[PDB]
Amino acid sequence: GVWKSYLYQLQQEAPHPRRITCTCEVENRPKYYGREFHGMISREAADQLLIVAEGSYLIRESQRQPGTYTLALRFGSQTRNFRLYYDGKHFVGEKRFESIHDLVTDGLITLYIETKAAEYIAKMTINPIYEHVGYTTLMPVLKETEKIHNFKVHTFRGPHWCEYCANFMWGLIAQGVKCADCGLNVHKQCSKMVPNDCKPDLKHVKKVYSCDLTTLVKAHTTKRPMVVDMCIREIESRGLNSEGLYRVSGFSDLIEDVKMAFDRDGEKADISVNMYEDINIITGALKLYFRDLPIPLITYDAYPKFIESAKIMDPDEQLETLHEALKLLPPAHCETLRYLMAHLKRVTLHEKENLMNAENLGIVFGPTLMRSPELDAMAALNDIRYQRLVVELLIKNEDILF
Ligand SMILES: [Zn+2]
Ligand SMILES: [Zn+2]
C-alpha cells in the first residue's frame, strides 16, 4: 500500500550492540562509563577485541588527545571510531542519549541503514506523497484541492512514517522532525522540501488512519482501534444480508469522508444510516483502514509462516502451523485480527442473502490484511493465491484457532 516497508524491515535486521566486557578495575575510570571501559589501549588492541562479532563495542581513551574518550565499534567487518562527549547525557553527534547502550543501538541502526540503502535513501524523495495524501484547511483533503513551517527535532514513541516521502523514520531517538505549528512528521532532509503551506489548525486533529496499530492502541488505552469497533458495530447493526458485502464498494469520495470523519471526530464520528445510507461506504472505510496501517494486520515478521501454512496439504498440520503463525503476531494485531475473523464468520452465516462465503470474502481480504516484505512487488504477486487462502482458513476455523 502507501507506506513503504523497506527502511522499517532494515531497522529490524540491524545488528544489536555487544558490549565487550573489560573484566577490569581501571584507574581514573569515569563513574559514568562501565564495563565497556578499557582505558588507553592501542588501535590494534581495539581491533583484536572487536573482531569477534558484528556490533561489538568498547570505550577507550584517545592516544592523540588524552583525557578524551572514543567509542570503537565493529561494523562492516571493520572498526569505526567515534569521539564521545558527556554532559549528563552521552552523545557523539547531535543526538543525546541516556545510555551508551542506547547510543550504540542508534549508531548501528544508522550505519546499517545508511550503508545498505544509500542509493535508495538518496532517491526516497522522487515522487513524494505529500501533495496527494493527507489533510489541509481551506478540514478538507489535499487530493480534493503561505506560512513557513517550523520544524523541530522530535522523538517518536512507536514507529512512525515520513508524511513527505512515505518512508520509515529510522533510529532509536530524534529519528525526524515535527512541526510545532501544524504537527507534520517528516525526515530532517525532507523538511527542506516541504512547501510553505503550514496550516496550524492541523495540530488540533489527532489522526487515527495510517497510524501504527500497536501505537494507536496504547495511546488510547482501548483493546482494538475505535475505527474497527465502530465500523464493525455499524455493519452488523443495519445487517449482514446486503449482497456483495465487502466485495462491492461505495463511492471513493464518501469513503475518504468517513476516514476524515474518524481522523477529526474519533469516538464521536457519525457513521449512522442517516449520514451514509450505503453500507458499502462503511465496508470500504473499514477495508481502507487496514490498507493504511504502516505495518499490516498480519505483520511482515509473521508473513512467511502464514504463507507456509497455506502451502501445506494436510488440513491438520496446516491448522497447526497456522495456529503457530498467530503466536508470531503482536498482542494488538492479534486481538484486532481475532475480532475481524469473528465478524467475517458471522457474515458468511448469511451466505444465502449476501452470497459471501469464506473463499470470496478471502478474495477481498487476503491482499488487504497481508503484504509480502519482499522488495519485488511484482514478484510478490505470485503469493496472492496463498494470501487469499490464509484469510479463507482464518475465517472458517476462526472458532477453534481463537
Ligand atoms: Zn521523508
Ligand atoms: Zn507546519
Swiss-Prot record:
Outcome of mutating residue 166 to V, per the record? In DURS2; behaves as a dominant gain-of-function allele that increases CHN1 activity in vitro; appears to enhance membrane translocation and CHN1 activity by destabilizing the closed conformation of CHN1 protein in response to phorbol 12-myristate 13-acetate (PMA)
Gene3D superfamilies hit by this protein: 3.30.60.20, Rho GTPase activation protein, SH2 domain
What keywords appear on the UniProt entry?
Acetylation, Disease variant, GTPase activation, Metal-binding, Neurogenesis, Phosphoprotein, SH2 domain, Zinc, Zinc-finger
Q: Which GO terms describe its biological process?
A: ephrin receptor signaling pathway; motor neuron axon guidance; regulation of axonogenesis; regulation of small GTPase mediated signal transduction
Identify the residue position(s) of the site Arginine finger.
247
Q: Which SMART domains match?
A: C1 (SM00109), RhoGAP (SM00324), SH2 (SM00252)
Q: Which CDD domains match?
A: C1_alphaCHN, RhoGAP_chimaerin, SH2_a2chimerin_b2chimerin
Output the PTM entry: Phosphorylated. Phosphorylation is EPHA4 kinase activity-dependent.
Q: Name one GO cellular component term.
A: cytosol
Q: Which residues are annotated as modified residue Phosphothreonine in the UniProt record? A: 283
PROSITE patterns according to UniProt: RHOGAP, SH2, ZF_DAG_PE_1, ZF_DAG_PE_2
For this protein, the record's InterPro entries field holds:
C1-like_sf, Chimaerin_SH2, CHN1/CHN2, DAG/PE-bd, PE/DAG-bd, Rho-type_GAP, Rho_GTPase_activation_prot, RhoGAP_chimaerin
> What ranges of residues constitute the Phorbol-ester/DAG-type zinc fingers?
148-198
Tissue specificity, in the record's words, reads:
In neurons in brain regions that are involved in learning and memory processes.
Q: What illness does the record link it to?
A: Duane retraction syndrome 2: A form of Duane retraction syndrome, a congenital eye movement disorder characterized by a failure of cranial nerve VI (the abducens nerve) to develop normally, resulting in restriction or absence of abduction, adduction or both, narrowing of the palpebral fissure, and retraction of the globe on attempted adduction. Undiagnosed in children, it can lead to amblyopia, a permanent uncorrectable loss of vision.
Biological role stated in the UniProt entry: GTPase-activating protein for p21-rac and a phorbol ester receptor. Involved in the assembly of neuronal locomotor circuits as a direct effector of EPHA4 in axon guidance.
User: What is known about its subunit structure?
Assistant: Interacts with EPHA4; effector of EPHA4 in axon guidance linking EPHA4 activation to RAC1 regulation.
**PANTHER family per the record?**
CHIMERIN FAMILY MEMBER (PTHR46075), N-CHIMAERIN (PTHR46075:SF1)
Its name, as the record gives it, is N-chimaerin
Organism of origin: Homo sapiens (Human)
